[PDB]
Each structure stands twice: as structure tokens, then as C-alpha cells.
């Protein structure tokens, strides 16, 4: 209902999508293969 209110108070188009799992910021603490990691979550906004 908040998305409908903000959708009618502003002229734009929306598309709600459901996210599955992976909501913890990705704490790369387990020794994978002694390589270099990169921020892929934390904020959770820029995937694509």
C-alpha cells in the first residue's frame, strides 16, 4: 500500500520483485581459496 501511495503521488512506473535468500552482507570469513573478494551485498542495491 505504501508502494501504491508513492506510485500515485509520483508519475513513474514500478515493478515489485521478491528476493530469495542472501540477506547478511556476505561476510567473507571462511578460507575459500586464498583469493581476493569483493563487496557483493552489504548495502544491497547495485547488483543489476
Amino acid at each position: 500500500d505504501l508502494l501504491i501511495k508513492l506510485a500515485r503521488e509520483m508519475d513513474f512506473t514500478y515493478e515489485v520483485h521478491l528476493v530469495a535468500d542472501g540477506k547478511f552482507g556476505t561476510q567473507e570469513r571462511v578460507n575459500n581459496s586464498n583469493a581476493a573478494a569483493w563487496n557483493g551485498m552489504m548495502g544491497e542495491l547495485l547488483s543489476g
Binding site: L3, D11, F12, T13, Y14, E15, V16, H17, L18, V19, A20, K23, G48
Partner: protein, 386 residues
């Protein structure tokens, strides 16, 4: 009698060696010589690496040379690069490049005492930054291969954008040799940014033109920014009419690089022999174990060279020993032909009287690079909320 000093050089055809020997004779005339005498000693590129190393140790090192030049092997293919040749002088601490365009020579690990007077491909990215000053761009997409050139161009573009100005979106990488690259066009098309900057070789750029051509991605709004390896050879007929290209001024037959090279080296010798210890290189590669003490000093004198009235323009080195104030030419493909639309002298880009044509049939660049009204919404999974 003046001291006989030798200068090493690695050239290709005999004509270039004649221009080198003539440039040494002119260097011994235009410069005041009271105690030194330059000597011309140049060899040719050999198809064998061992025969080339023995040719340097029995031709160049045996003559006790100080500065050694290098160009490019006259071969249509690429399988034996002259980079190991630069390792030879690495045993005796300087090699100056003339046609080296790869950014791998920009590093100082395997190229300690290696300086070049030719702007590589990474410097072209700087010109690309100047493009961001023309139409005021923001979100750009850099699509490079998975090698050292893509990492060097990525660190260079990231270094240029270190202030609070414009940033990067997503950098795409691909293995050089894969034709099925539709996922790169799908993920690149899904992203809001449309400024595509391609920097690869010919076979990769051909696959980008084919895969990007069979998906209808050359219309309005799509910008293709390439360099020089994407509008030459077999990658020219597949490129859309209106793609922004580049062209280095005086690509073939660079006599000014040889003449100005002997001028800068001669200035570094006549000026270097006016301080005081100045050791001498050993005789050949036999019975010589010690290194050269005048290495970083000779590289320092070669780097601190200024020629505002030179033939090529303004010879000046930077902190990495590369070429400053590059001279390029912004080209554009119009009706299956490369029409000159701009030139780059070194400081700013100067356009001629030809109007820039876009591949999407457009003639005027809009203000905003990309804008729409589609907004994606994401949320979590909760019973009382969603």
C-alpha cells in the same frame, strides 16, 4: 682525440639504420663535441630469440654501448615479442621504445630501466576522458578483455576518476578467444548505462560487432567508443557507420622518432659527461659479473629531457617514462569510409568542419545520456509486511 662512445639500437630494415647512422653524424655536428665522439651501431630483428641474444652480446654489448633503441619486429603476425630483448639491458641496468603500444611496458617490475617516447593505448583512454569533457558524460561502461591491457586500462581509467566527478558503473571482462558472448550484451543492455567503451583486439571486436549486431543494439542512445584496433583489418566492415574512432599521427615510417631519439640520447650524453665518475659498460657478455652503477642516473637524465621545438612536437617524460602531449586524430566511419572529424594535438581536442554522425541515425547529441521512467522495486519476504 675525443672519447669513442657507442650507442646501441634495434631497428628493422636497412633504411632505418641509414637514418640512424645519418642522425648520429648530424648529432656529432649540431652539438658541440670537445671530448666525446658518438658512434652508430644498430642491428636488425632476428626471427630467432637465441640468435638475437647472441647478436646483442656479440654486436651491441661487445661494442660497449650505453643507450639501446628498439622498434618492432617486421612481421604480420605476433608470436615472438621483443620484450625479452629488454631483459638483456636489464642485466646491465636503458631501452627506449619507439612503436611499443602495449601498456605492459608501463610497469616497472620487468621494465626497470625501460622508457619509451610513444603514447600507448592507456594514454588513449586519457583522450577518452577528454570525450567526457565534450558532451559531459557520467555513467560509462568499459568492456575490455581479460589480460594485462584490460587491467592497466582499468587502473588508468580508475586513476583518472579519483576526484568527486563521474564514476564507473560495471566493467565487463571476457577471455580473448570466446565467440559466444551474448551474456555480455544481455547484462550490458539490462544496465541503465548505455555508454559502451570497447577496448580489445580484432577478433574480439569482431565478435562484439556480430553479437551486438544480431541483437539490435546499434540504434539511438547507444554510444560506441573504441580506439584504433577496432576500425582496422577485418573489424572495419562489421563496425557501424558513425562509430567514434582514433588514429595515431604518423603510424608508419617514423623518422622523426629516430632523429629526435638520437637528439635526446646525444643531449643526455653531452650533458651526462659533464658531471663526474661516469663508469663504462663492460666488454661483451663474457667474463662480466658486475652490473652497471650508472643505471638509474642515466634513466634520470633520459627522463629529464625537454624539447618544445622538436619535430614531433613537445618531447616530455612523466613519472613512468612514457610520452606526454600525444598527437591523435578522432576519426568517424561515414559511408564505409574513415572521415576525419577531429584532431588531438595534446592539450585540447580541435574539431574540423565535418559534423559528427551517430550510428543510430542521429545528428545532434541530447543533453542527458540516458533517461526513462522505469523503476525497479525489490523487497523481502515477511507475512505482515509483504
Amino acid at each position: 682525440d675525443p672519447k669513442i662512445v657507442n650507442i646501441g639500437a634495434v631497428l628493422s630494415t636497412k633504411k632505418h639504420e641509414q637514418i640512424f647512422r645519418e642522425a648520429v653524424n648530424q648529432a656529432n655536428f649540431f652539438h658541440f663535441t670537445r671530448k666525446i665522439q658518438l658512434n652508430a651501431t644498430s642491428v636488425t630483428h632476428r626471427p630467432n630469440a637465441i640468435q638475437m641474444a647472441l647478436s646483442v652480446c656479440e654486436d651491441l654489448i661487445s661494442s660497449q654501448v650505453y643507450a639501446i633503441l628498439v622498434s618492432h619486429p617486421p612481421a604480420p603476425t605476433d608470436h615472438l615479442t621483443p620484450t625479452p630483448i629488454s631483459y638483456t639491458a636489464g642485466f646491465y641496468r636503458p631501452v627506449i621504445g619507439l612503436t611499443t603500444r602495449m601498456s605492459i611496458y608501463s610497469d616497472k617490475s620487468i621494465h626497470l630501466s625501460f622508457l619509451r617516447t610513444v603514447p600507448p593505448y592507456s594514454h588513449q583512454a586519457l583522450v577518452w576522458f577528454e570525450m567526457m569533457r565534450l558532451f559531459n558524460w557520467n555513467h560509462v561502461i568499459l568492456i575490455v578483455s581479460d589480460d594485462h591491457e584490460g587491467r592497466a586500462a582499468q587502473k588508468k581509467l580508475e586513476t583518472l576518476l579519483e576526484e568527486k566527478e563521474s564514476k564507473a558503473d560495471k566493467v565487463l571482462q571476457f577471455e580473448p578467444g570466446t565467440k559466444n558472448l551474448t551474456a555480455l550484451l544481455l547484462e550490458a543492455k539490462e544496465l541503465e548505462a548505455r555508454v559502451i567503451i570497447l577496448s580489445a583486439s580484432e577478433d574480439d571486436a569482431t565478435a562484439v560487432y556480430k553479437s551486438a549486431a544480431m541483437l539490435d543494439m546499434t540504434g539511438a542512445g547507444y554510444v560506441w567508443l573504441v580506439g584504433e584496433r577496432e576500425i582496422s583489418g577485418s573489424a572495419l566492415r562489421y563496425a557501424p557507420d558513425g562509430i567514434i574512432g582514433l588514429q595515431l599521427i604518423n603510424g608508419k615510417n617514423e623518422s622523426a622518432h629516430i632523429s629526435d631519439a638520437v637528439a635526446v640520447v646525444a643531449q643526455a650524453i653531452h650533458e651526462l659527461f659533464e658531471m663526474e665518475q661516469i663508469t663504462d659498460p663492460p666488454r661483451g657478455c663474457v667474463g662480466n659479473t658486475n652490473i652497471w652503477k650508472t643505471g638509474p642516473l642515466f634513466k634520470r637524465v633520459l627522463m629529464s629531457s625537454k624539447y618544445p621545438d622538436g619535430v614531433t612536437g613537445r618531447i616530455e617524460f612523466n613519472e613512468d617514462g612514457d610520452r606526454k602531449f600525444a598527437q591523435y586524430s578522432i576519426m568517424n566511419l561515414q559511408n564505409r569510409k574513415l572521415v576525419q572529424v577531429g584532431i588531438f594535438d595534446g592539450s585540447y581536442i580541435i574539431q574540423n568542419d565535418r559534423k559528427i554522425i551517430w550510428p543510430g541515425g542521429e545528428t545532434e547529441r541530447p543533453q542527458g545520456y540516458q533517461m526513462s521512467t522505469r523503476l525497479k522495486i525489490v523487497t523481502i519476504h515477511q507475512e505482515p509486511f509483504v
